[PDB]
Amino acid sequence: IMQKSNKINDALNQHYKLNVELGLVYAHYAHVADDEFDMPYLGKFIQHLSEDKLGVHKEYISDYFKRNGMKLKTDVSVAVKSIPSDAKALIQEVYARENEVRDHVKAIAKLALAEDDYESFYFIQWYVRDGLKDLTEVDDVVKLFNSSNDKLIIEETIKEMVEKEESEHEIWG
């Protein structure tokens, strides 16, 4: 009874890998944001995101696996070989990656229902919610580049964003 789904096990190992590799890319993008583009607050924003991916996003999968018999796999391959040309494009790339996260998560949820794995459907709810939350935070920064042509003005707004004491939306938080 209660035999773990091998299909969910694979999908969640692939999502663990995605969050590790994303976090490593974001750490690089945070360096570049500060170093090459002269936007240290944009750097801090991306760095916070790197740490989210390499922290809780991966941790919760490992924890879940310990509880249900699923096997963890660690297989990572990532290389930053090209960087976006400017800051606007850097954050737009981050946006595209977060949009893909939402698509991957949707798939896992759909799979959990197909496999009648209600514990996994429950688990993924955090990721479903976070898919949108994280995208929204990134979108809030993307908007800035369309609203001013002054990098320092944009930076002042990012500063408040990163320095605000984090509030949780009742639903998406």
Instruction: Restricting to residues 55-114, name those near Fe ion by CB under 5 A.
Output: 59, 63, 65, 79, 81-82, 86-87, 104, 110-111, 114
Among 11, 20, 90, 141, binds a copy of itself (CB under 8 A): 20
CA distances from 108 to 14, 19, 95, 118, 157 (A): 10, 14, 20, 12, 35
Among 15, 44, 58, 97, binds Fe ion (CB under 5 A): 15
Among 6, 85, 125, 136, binds Mg ion (CB under 5 A): 6
6 binds, among Fe ion, Mg ion, a copy of itself, none (CB under 5 to 8 A by kind): Mg ion
- Interface residues for a copy of itself in 29-68 (CB under 8 A)? 31-32, 34-35, 38-40, 54, 56, 58, 60, 62-68
Alpha-carbon distance of 95 to 91, in angstroms, equals: 6
Q: Are 33 and 83 in contact (CB under 8 A)?
A: no
Size of interface with a copy of itself, in residues (CB under 8 A) = 77
Alpha-carbon distance of 47 to 92, in angstroms, equals: 15
Alpha-carbon distance of 138 to 40, in angstroms, equals: 16
